[PDB]
Amino acid sequence: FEERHLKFLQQLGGSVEMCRYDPLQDNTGEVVAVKKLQHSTEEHLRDFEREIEILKSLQHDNIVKYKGVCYRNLKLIMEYLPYGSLRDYLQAHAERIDHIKLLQYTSQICKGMEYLGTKRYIHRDLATRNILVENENRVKIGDFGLTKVLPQDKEYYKVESPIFWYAPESLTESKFSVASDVWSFGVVLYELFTYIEKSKSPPAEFMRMIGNDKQGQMIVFHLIELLKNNGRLPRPDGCPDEIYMIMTECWNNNVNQRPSFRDLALRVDQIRDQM
Numbered sequence: 324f325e326e327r328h329l330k331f332l333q334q335l336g337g338s339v340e341m342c343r344y345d346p347l348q349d350n351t352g353e354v355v356a357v358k359k360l361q362h363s364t365e366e367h368l369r370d371f372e373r374e375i376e377i378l379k380s381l382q383h384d385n386i387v388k389y390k391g392v393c394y395r396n397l398k399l400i401m402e403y404l405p406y407g408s409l410r411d412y413l414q415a416h417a418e419r420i421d422h423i424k425l426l427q428y429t430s431q432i433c434k435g436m437e438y439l440g441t442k443r444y445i446h447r448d449l450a451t452r453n454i455l456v457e458n459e460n461r462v463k464i465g466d467f468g469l470t471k472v473l474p475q476d477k478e479y480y481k482v483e484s485p486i487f488w489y490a491p492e493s494l495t496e497s498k499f500s501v502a503s504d505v506w507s508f509g510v511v512l513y514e515l516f517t518y519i520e521k522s523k524s525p526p527a528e529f530m531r532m533i534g535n536d537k538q539g540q541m542i543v544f545h546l547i548e549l550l551k552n553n554g555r556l557p558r559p560d561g562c563p564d565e566i567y568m569i570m571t572e573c574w575n576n577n578v579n580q581r582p583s584f585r586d587l588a589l590r591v592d593q594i595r596d597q598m
């Protein structure tokens with residue numbers, strides 16, 4: 324890939340843009356997503372080079388496809404998924420997404436996380452805003468900017484954070500693992516069943532439970548205390564109990580008692596059948 328052949332189309336949201344790669348100067352080229360760094364350092368560049376190796380190493384249906392790189396001024400080039408983040412697509416098109424559909428996505432996210440696990444990768448930022456929509460019947464995990472490799476001899480990796488998606492051990496000991504990704508997956512499942520209604524977001528709920536007066540450094544302490552005492556996001560309206568039970572099982576204070584992404588996929592698919 325050569326940087327003189329990228330035609331800028333629009334900003335998507337380190338930044339991400341929509342580009343055309345068109346070396347034939349003839350508009351035939353395909354549309355691709357391009358990631359780069361907003362204001363970059365050497366440590367911020369070092370991490371970015373790993374992410375790129377990480378994504379190149381991944382080949383899966385529910386994981387956005389690595390296309391290449393281009394320079395120097397490093398840019399990551401990937402396939403362009405036309406419907407954007409699942410977070411926004413649900414806000415846009417709630418009227419056609421039913422619970423079977425939410426479970427369809429849910430199952431696909433699992434499968435992607437399962438595969439990630441087989442490479443000993445920990446994602447660390449699993450939330451609906453990092454899930455892209457390829458089309459109406461398929462979603463993919465769309466960002467790996469915080470993803471880490473597990474050591475050969477350990478089952479966790481020690482490291483502004485998405486605290487309202489984090490497991491207690493991530494909050495208290497900075498430990499990330501497959502079990503922490505599963506916790507976050509619980510939050511993702513909650514998101515999906517709230518249809519991203521605004522007052523029902525994990526930050527809004529948690530703040531509501533902590534107290535909205537609380538500020539800055541204290542919030543994390545109080546969030547940790549809340550989870551310690553089994554405070555949890557409530558069941559979303561219209562969420563069947565059996566589905567909430569999966570959420571609460573993911574949100575177990577005990578790391579080892581949390582389910583595997585394989586167990587979850589099955590229980591989800593099974594539940595989907597029955598509707």
Ligand SMILES: C[C@H](Nc1nc(Nc2cn(C)cn2)nc(N2CCOCC2)n1)c1ncc(F)cn1
Nearest residue numbers: 335336339356402403404407408453454465466
């Ligand atoms: C910032 C970007 N936002 C984005 N990306 C894509 N597509 C995309 C990103 N990547 C990496 C691949 N395809 N499409 C949109 N829509 C498209 C239509 O107009 C509104 C925004 N937004 C994005 N990147 C990763 C992610 F997980 C979620 N969001």
